[PDB]
Every structure is written in C-alpha cells, then in structure tokens.
Design a binder for this molecule. Structure first.
Ligand code: NA
Ligand code: NA
Lengths: 249, 249, 264, 264
C-alpha cells in the first residue's frame, strides 16, 4: 500500500499524511509526479485548498485520479534555532517567500532581519548563532532541529485542505465533489449551478472555477440523495456535463 | 517610473511587461517583494489568473495596492537547443514541472526522455548535444539561445492574466474589480452576489473565492454606472462589505 | 359601531359576520353591492366592513384590491370561511322526492357534481331567500350551509358541496391606517416605476432571501398605463430588521412599497 | 356555429363579441351567467364561448380558471376590450340638466370620480337596458360605451370612465384541445405535488432562465386540500426546445405541467 505524497520528509503534505491517518510512504519531488504514480492501484495525498493544484484539479477532471478522502491541515509555523539560542538571541531569519508573508508580523514584533531561500531544507542550512529558520512545525525535527517558538504565523486558523486520491471510481458518502462543465457560453453559468443546489438547500462547502470560459469544482455537504440526483438532472437539462469526482465522509 | 515585476529577464511577468506596453524595469525575485516595493509611488506587473497569487489577491484586499490595468499573456512554450541541433536530434528535455504538464503531449509525440529542474534558467544550463530545454517563448533568447520549435504546449489558447498595480486609489473605466466580504456566515453568500449582478445583467468576466468562510473577488464588464451603484447598495443591505480594488479599460 | 357587508341576509358575507362578530358589539348593516360596502366603510369612521379578498365564488375581489391600493380603506384583520352548501326543502321531502332545485348561480357552480349525481332539474334565482320561496312538494333550494335556518327552514341533506376544502378569505376593513403592533403578518402594496422583465420574481426572490413566507400574492393592472402592474403580498413576519432590509432592496430596485394592512 | 357569452345584450361580453366576430360566421347565444356559458361551450362541440379571464369588473374569473384547470374547456384565443363608459340621456338633456343617474354596480364603481365631479345622485339597476328605462327629463344612464346605441339611445357625454387604460381580457374558449400550431403564446397549468416554501418563485425563476416572458400569471387554490395551489401562466414563446427544457425542469421539481391553451 504505497502512499504517494509531496516530499521531502517535513512538508505539509507529509505532515498531513502522518498526523492524520498515522502505509508505505513514497515521497515525490512535486505533484505532477505524485499524480502520475497514483494514476499502479495505490494511494495519494495532495492539497486542494490554499497551499503555501492547477495540476490536481486538472487530473481530477481527466478522470485519471478520484478523491476518496479529506484531510485538513492546521497550518503552523515554528522557529528553529541551533540548540538553546533563546528567542531573544535571534538576529536574523531565513524562510521561503510565502512563509515570510504568513509570519510577517512575527518578524516585526521582534525586528528580525530576514531573507529568502528556495526551500525549507535551505532554511535549516542557514541555522547558526543568531540565525533561525521559519518553517512548518513538525518539520525541522525530521532533520534533528528544535523549535525556538511555535504558532508563529500572523493569523490564527489558516488551514490547507488535502485530498486522498486513487485510480479507482469506487465511491454511504456524506460529502460529494462534482466537476460541472458548461457545454456553451452564456451569462450566469456559475449562478445557474449555485442556484440549483440552493433550491434543495444543499450547502456547498467549497467551490472553484477553472478554464475565457470556466468549468466548476463544487463540493456539497450531503449524501447520494434523491435531491442530489434532481439537481444533476436539472444541470444536464441546463447543458452542464456533470461528473462526480469525489465522495467521502 | 520604476516598473516592478517577477524576474529574472525571460519570465512570463517580464514578457508581459515587454510585449504589451513596450519605463525603468526593476526585476524582483518573487511576488511578495514586488508588492512591497509598489506599496514608493511606482508601478507593478503581477499575475492574477492561472499562472505557471494568494499573496496578490491578499495585498489587493489589504488596500496596500490597487489595480489600474490588465494584460493577458499568450502562454507559449518553445524548445531551445544548442544551435542547429535539429528537432529530430533531441534525445532529452529539461523543464520545470508545471511546464512538463503543459507540454506532456509534445514530449510524447516525439518520445523524449525528460526530467525536472528548479528553474527555466537551470533548463538552459542543461542544453547540450541531444538535450533541449522547454521554456517560455521570448525567454531563451534573453540568454542567447534559439528555439528548435515554438507553440509547443498541448492546448492551444492557454492564457495568464496580469494586473497593473499601484499604491494609488486614483481610478471612465469600463471594467471594475470588487472585493466583496461577508460580515456573517449563512448559506448561499456567493449566490447572493452573483444574483445581484445578474439582476442588472452585469456580466462577470472573473470571479474568485478566498478565506471556513470566504471573501469574493469579482470583475465586472461595466463602467461606473447607476446600476453598479445599485448592486453596491443591495450588497451592503445584504451585509457585504464592498470595496472597489480595480478600475480600468 | 357599524359592520358593513354584502347582503341580503343569508349570503356568505352575512355568515362570516355571524361567525366572526357579536350583534351586541356591532350593528349589522347589509349593503347591495361591494362598491356600497367599501364606500360606507370609507365614509363611516366608526365602521368596519367585511369584504371578500381571496377565492370569491361570486363577484370579483378587484374592487376590494383597488380600494386598498388607493388607500380608501385599510386591512385590520382576515377571516376564513368554509364554502359549504345544504339542500333545503319542505320539512317533508326526502332527497328521493326532489324533482327540482333553485339556486343562485354561484351555488350551482359549486354543487354541479351533486346536481348531476341526483339528476335534479334546476333553475336560477337572484338570492337565497328567493330559492327558499320556490320550495314546495318535490322542489328544493340549494343554499349556503346555515342560511336556510336564518329563515326558518331545515335541510333535507347537508355538506353537499362538490369539494371539501373550498375557503373564501375575507378582510376586515376600516377607513383608518393604524395597525395592531405585535402584528405577525404584513400586507404590502408594491408598485414598479418602470417596466422591466421579471418584476414579480424580483419581489418574491427578495422575500425568500430572508426566508420569509408569503401567504398571499395578488396582482392588479395600473390602469393609468397599459402593461404595468402592482403587487399585493401578505408576509408572515412581524416588523423586523429583515423586513426593513427587503423594503430597502425593493426601493433600490425602483418599486415603491407601502404597508396596506397588518394584523394576526 | 354557436358563440356563447354572458348576456343580456349590451354587456361588455356582448360588445367583445360584436368587436371580434361576425354575426354571419357565428350565431350569438347570450346566457344568464358564466356558469351557463361554460357549460354550453362544454356540451356544444361546434361552439366557442367568450369569457372573462383577466381584470373582470364584475364577477370572478375563478369559475373560468377552474373550467380550464378541469379541462372542461380549452383556450383557443384571447381578446382585449377597453372598458369605457358613456352617459346616455333623453336626446334633449345636456349634462347641466342631469340630476340623477342609474347604472349597474360595476359601471358606478368605474365612473365614481365622474359621478362626484358632477354631483349626480345615483341608484343601481340590474342591467344596462334597465338603466335605459329610467331615462326621462333630468335622468341619465351610465352604460358601456356603445351599448345604448344597441337600443336606440344617444350619449350626452362619452369616455366618462375615471381611468383611461382599464382593459378586460377575454378568452375565446372551446370544448376541444387542439391548438393553432405556429402558436406564439402558450398557456400552462402548473401544479405542485407537495407543499414547499417558494413554489411560485421556482416556476417564474425557471422561465427567466431561458429569458421567456410571462404575460399572465394567475393562482387558484387546490380546494381538495387546504393550503395548496395551482398556477396559470401564459408564455410568449412558440413550442421550442427552451420550452421543453422548462417543463423538464418543472417536472424534475415535482410540478405537473399541462398545456391549457395555445394561440396568438
Ligand atoms: Na368545506
Ligand atoms: Na379606456
């Protein structure tokens, strides 16, 4: 049971693999390579919402891969030092760009100097007297480093969402993921779609547009119900191609 | 007139700077750094739709930066060789991961071996006898390289969209960009919004959700009109915070 | 205090007045037609009137809806009347004896399956008391259930209506515009200023947004211009912030909105 | 061929029949009430009937709407009649001479500002010919414009209605259900199977989706159950693919849909 995910050890992907469903781990260098692998009858963990995905949504649409589960990662950044450098000894920090913005206020509270690095790995490289790396919690410790502080990010409940993927359309599910594709351009296509679910009061937890026409990624809090089959009928009558790409709990 | 954008010379950002509004160029290492700079009373070019942006949408929301123009880049990949290696001499190619997926069929038509590289710069490094780099057209030539072929991507009209940004809320505009933020959670908030514009038949060219609540990025094909002021009134009555973040032609 | 309604005695209006009011807290004042009823309420400051508003079986509610639109009169309550009928005869006859019935037109129309099942011959009369005067051996009157006993007659048969849940809704009306004020249903007049496609949907979509039920929706033509309409709507809500929201939205959409009623 | 309508001669129905038909392609058959009209059309296979459907000023359209719902009768066309009135007198009198008018109730209600401006005293009569019989020195009849000249009288004054664009819409009805077939407006009966909030909006929202205008929307109560309704809708469209789409959607939403009319 090969579990393909974005590596190396210590990424968000790996953290969510581990911290959630604690199973032979197979790290991949980026996501194209993890989707390919999954699409051998194996498993994959891979982000969809707000990561630090075109590719993912896209393979989901190709029917190369299907979503059987969800995992929501508590985004969290730590500060890693050289071993009892105390926080007040940190002169300078090193982190990738998206993480500097996640933690820009922390940098400021403390008036750290800072600059950028291609990797969290490279962040760890820079650690020395008066130098700390901002990286995800649970991640510096893969390579023997101990946080100076933790929950470092400016905003309190930032979350990334991860899908469990397979090459198996094998979906008692109580959340459903749909690709809804317009067969022609007209005004208000997204509106059509949202309104059809809202007829039936089917709450949509997540919705996404992707290509100047767009197709639609929607996720609904509800089981396979007769109401769901109705909105499907209506959408098809409205000219939407409808394929279910996820079903889970 | 410092023009801040994502570098180095030969990125999509730079290409759109150049090919569109052909002006003192100031390349930046990534986008956080270009938004900061813009937010000195200067200019910025920066992508919003489908790039190969959390950060961008986010600064637009902070009112740190405002959009005064649009540029749509014809995505396009070329094949760069060592100088009359003909296409049939290419054994292997090197490119970043998102570009391999853009061109996966081209790789296959020709049965190239392939692997990944951190950069287009690094792609160019690998060029030798029997080795070619897949990179954006107009980009290998910044560093003296000539395409083996061009329009290499699998799908024909992929496009990225770029905003012209400023630290100036100084908006005769005929496209309008709004941040619409819900003051509370209830079902169908996005629906509310789309339906209000559709009352007035105001076509929305682009719409985006971002944070488990969401705020909304919408762009409307219409001027500052009395109808637009109406939908604004309605949205405020519905409890949406409304700020205009873009206005252009 | 005056209670105007459509007479003569034994109409459905009259019955609604009996069901819903004491004779010893109102003086009953029958009028000849609905125009007169509304006119009397309009001019008598210590009056109410009871007037059909939904599912009349005789005569149009438009005249009532127009009085309300022009604010000649105001709605201060509603009452629902079951529309049921009986067969009234000579005290002797059984149903097997009846050869012929006489009835007002509205009553025939509601009891036609009845009339047919029984193969009665029939003819029309101008009023229920008229009906009653045709009674003799083998002749019956079809009348509002309980109207024959207002004149000293007895049914041969009752509950003879063809449908069981036919209900006419009446308004209790007054010439004063000041309403109960823990009101739990609201009536609005809503008038578009310009012609636009989908005006009614607009209105209904707005109330749905705040999940507020409409128990009644009526339209009437402007009459001052071809093609234009106004809307009558009754909402199950007290006057709340949600309600002020829909009015604001409707006004932004260029409808004028006015409360024409409020009660329980 | 029979043309049933509400009499006697000189009603608005009668006038609509004159405006819209030859006497020499129909035999005119007045009936006493709308129930009789609909009943005659229902039983006469070579018949039409002309019957009010929108903006009646006298008497309810519900009976017509119910006949249509039960498919006793079918709509094969519509005609619009201007509702206008004249003052009819003794050939001698001028308006300055008139002390008193007599009129049917519906006519008083539409000419009341008129009556008031001129300070006529008035009273009611049961029909326009009755009106006409009250005429003498200082006494006039208010009647449908062109109905006095059906009996040999002349107006003292015309176009005396208080509003200029009051229009009653009539249906041309038949007991056969087979329609014109380059039809450009469609009438549907649409009935929900279950009670749900926002049923009417559902229907209207569905037609809007395909940008199809509704020129008329009416509701009627089920009557077999409390609380339930059916919907009458007239759509400006021929029978197209868009139309088949809305019906499919409506049926998916658990309405039954049936064509009750189709014409131009
Ligand atoms: Na009953
Ligand atoms: Na007129």
């Amino acid at each position: 049971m090969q579990l393909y995910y974005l590596g190396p050890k210590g990424t968000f992907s790996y953290l969510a693999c581990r911290q959630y469903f604690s199973a032979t781990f197979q790290p991949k260098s980026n996501l194209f390579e993890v989707i390919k692998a999954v699409a051998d009858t194996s498993i994959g963990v891979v982000p969809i919402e707000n990561s630090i995905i075109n590719i993912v949504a896209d393979a989901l649409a190709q029917q190369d891969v299907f979503a059987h589960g969800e995992i929501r990662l508590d985004i969290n950044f730590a500060l890693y030092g050289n071993g009892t450098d105390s926080i007040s000894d940190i002169k300078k920090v090193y982190s990738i760009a998206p993480a500097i913005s996640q933690t820009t206020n922390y940098i400021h509270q403390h008036q750290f100097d800072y600059d950028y690095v291609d990797s969290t790995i490279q962040s760890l490289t820079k650690i020395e007297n008066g130098v700390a790396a901002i990286a995800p919690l649970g991640s510096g410790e893969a390579y023997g480093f101990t946080p100076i502080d933790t929950h470092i990010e400016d905003y309190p409940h930032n979350v990334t969402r991860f899908l469990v993927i397979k090459n198996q359309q094998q979906f008692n599910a109580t959340s459903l993921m749909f690709l809804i594709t317009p067969m022609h351009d007209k005004p208000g296509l997204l509106a059509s779609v949202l309104n059809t679910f809202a007829l039936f009061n089917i709450n949509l937890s997540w919705i996404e547009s992707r290509p100047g026409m767009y197709r639609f990624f929607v996720q609904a809090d509800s089981a396979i119900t007769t109401d769901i089959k109705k909105v499907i009928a209506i959408l098809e009558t409205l000219d939407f191609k409808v394929e279910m790409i996820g079903a889970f709990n």
